[PDB]
Amino acid sequence: AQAPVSVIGLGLMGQALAAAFLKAGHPTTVWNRRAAKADQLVSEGATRAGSVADAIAASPLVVLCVSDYGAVRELLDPLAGSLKGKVVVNYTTGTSTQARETAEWAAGVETTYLDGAIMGPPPWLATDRAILLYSGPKAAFEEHEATLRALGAAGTTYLDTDHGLSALYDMSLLGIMWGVLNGFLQGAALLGTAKVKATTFAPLANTLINLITERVTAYAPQIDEGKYPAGDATMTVHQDAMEHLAEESETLGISAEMPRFFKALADRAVADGHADSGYAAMIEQFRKP
Amino acid sequence: AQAPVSVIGLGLMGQALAAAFLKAGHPTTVWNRRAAKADQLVSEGATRAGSVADAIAASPLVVLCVSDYGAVRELLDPLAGSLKGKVVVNYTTGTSTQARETAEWAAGVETTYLDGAIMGPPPWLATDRAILLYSGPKAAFEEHEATLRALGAAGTTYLDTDHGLSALYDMSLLGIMWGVLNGFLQGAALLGTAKVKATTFAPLANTLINLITERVTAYAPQIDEGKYPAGDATMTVHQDAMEHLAEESETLGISAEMPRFFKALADRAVADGHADSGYAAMIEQFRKP
């Protein structure tokens, strides 16, 4: 109690946010375009705001989670005068550029605005797996740190004052997640041709995912120094193995699109004269517009 | 000791394999097309064979690890009669088909053949992080399991009698490594634009890579069931986030090829009517030639 919060936007991630605040004993007011998306929470103790104004007026902490920043502007523009003395935390997925622009607007209507990024599925909220990054005024963050930590004590992390940093980190970590899921999906498509079940491949795949973190830590400084030694394998070795994965995919009858794509990037790596460097030299390829 | 082993092919992974046998006290004989690449091993207590013939005779367990299955045929075929009373272990990277064609050739010459797959960089061998998959006659694996353990006791696994299973599992795991690494490189390029040094982003990435295994575990049964519910995020939400990552990359002057490629697969999913399914539905896109 004594710390009301309003969640504007009741999607899957929004609902999880309102639930976390409710369970944590915070007076939680919710609002969503489709009112039906707020019934469960209201029946569980949440206060249903009839309008965006009702939600904004219910608490000093206003949490935003909608589809796009376009929906963010549409909801925040008509109340630029109603945000006096409040703090706005926006968990909506967007680009760093969109984050800074909404900050500019916020800075103009004299209101505290925090840009937040939720890293992972809604089920991770209010669990040990929850990771939430914040960017903006460090003061406002600390004012509500107790309230914010209801969504994940250990995972809460204040980034800095640059409002776009949260979105940037959000985008960078998302590429990692899709890279893992797609890699796993490509591997599961293969072993399925041998009547191997995805569940059977899941533990082995996860063992390898966890271990590769070691290589991740190894290539990190090489990306910083600009020197890419080939202590584990040369780009040519990678290129060859990528060709085997491509060829194996076409043979077994599954998509070889991703293998071809990976081998294409290795082509340019060796094309740039990095055939005898470690995979870290791939950073140059990803820096090319 | 008491278990002499021969290692044919002394590149990076062959040198590490031999170095493990030597470190475990095995009388280790090495051979490489280029002799100089074995001088380091001889000064450390390894015996250099002048020819493949000497190496084959030197030990009852012959471990191969060369540039490709093309060289395995080049070196094995001339020794069809000299392979009696011996066990050949081929750690070369190749397709499931190649591992079978090689496995069938061995049956003709009445030699014991085990198709081995080494998961991870060379330096993981002889540590708790080494993953080594074996395919073939169980009796052969059981009879030389102690010798093979020198490269990794916790990773030494027997897959079954299908010799290509190793190459398959190998191939499947290769995709996961490039996905994680490429995803990490993509994010490193993004955060690099904001002067975020890679070693500062590595630990965070490693936290997500570790976490995402939970999502891998969740999708595994949906893949085997053919039902892809959207409890975390629908294909639509995945789609919108990929576009943002794509716009973000282009805005920051880096490569949007991987993001735009990730979105293409997602669009194909929505094109097949999976806009309301979870990401496990993309398995159908990887099953498409």
Nearest to B241 among A93, A164, A213 (CB): A93
Nearest to B213 among A123, A209, A216 (CB): A209
Count Cα neighbours of B57 within 13 Å in the Cβ-side half-sphere.
6
Long-range Cβ contacts of B266-275 (<8 Å, 24+ apart): B266/B235, B266/B238, B266/B239, B266/B242, B267/B239, B269/B235, B270/B235, B270/B236, B270/B239, B274/B228, B274/B235, B275/B234, B275/B235, B275/B236, B275/B239
Dihedral sign, CA of A136, B208, B216, A265? positive
Q: Does A229 touch chain B (CB under 8 A)?
A: no
Q: What share of chain A is helix, strand, coil (3-state, %, to 5)?
A: 60, 10, 30
Task: List B residues 56-115 in contact with A (Cβ-Cβ < 8 A).
Answer: 67-68, 93-97
Q: Does B2 touch chain A (CB under 8 A)?
A: no
Closest residue on chain A to B96 (Cα): A248
Domains and CATH numbers, chain A: 5-160 (3.40.50.720), 197-286 (1.10.1040.10)
**Integer distance in angstroms from the first to the last C-alpha of chain B?**
50
Residues of chain B contacting residue A251, judged by C-beta atoms under 8 Å apart? 95-97
Cα–Cα distance list, B149 to A96, B146, B170 (Å):
50, 5, 19
Residue A122 carries which DSSP code? G
Radius of gyration of chain A (CA): 23
Contact present, A115 and A92 (Cβ < 8 Å): no
Radius of gyration of chain B (CA): 23
Chain-chain contact of A216 with B202 (C-beta, under 8 angstroms)? yes
CA distance A75 to chain B (A): 19
Q: Does B215 touch chain A (CB under 8 A)?
A: yes
For residues A191 and B164, give the distance between their C-alpha atoms in angstroms, rounded to a whole number. 11
H helix count then E strand count, chain A? 12, 8
Nearest to A208 among B131, B168, B201 (CB): B131
DSSP lists the bridge partners of residue A118 as A132
Cα–Cα distance list, B132 to A205, A246, B91, B236 (Å):
13, 22, 9, 39
Q: Does A221 touch chain B (CB under 8 A)?
A: yes
Residues of chain A contacting residue B119, judged by C-beta atoms under 8 Å apart? 208
Nearest to B279 among A164, A181, A223 (CB): A181
Closest residue on chain A to B166 (Cα): A191
Nearest to A178 among B204, B223, B262 (CB): B262
User: Which helix (H) or strand (E) element contains residue A133?
Assistant: strand A132-135
**Residue A289 structure tokens:** 């517009």
* Tokens 């968990």, located at residue: A91
Task: List A residues 21-60 in contact with B (Cβ-Cβ < 8 A).
Answer: none
Residue A158 carries which DSSP code? E
Cα–Cα distance list, B83 to A173, B4, B10, B62 (Å):
51, 15, 20, 9
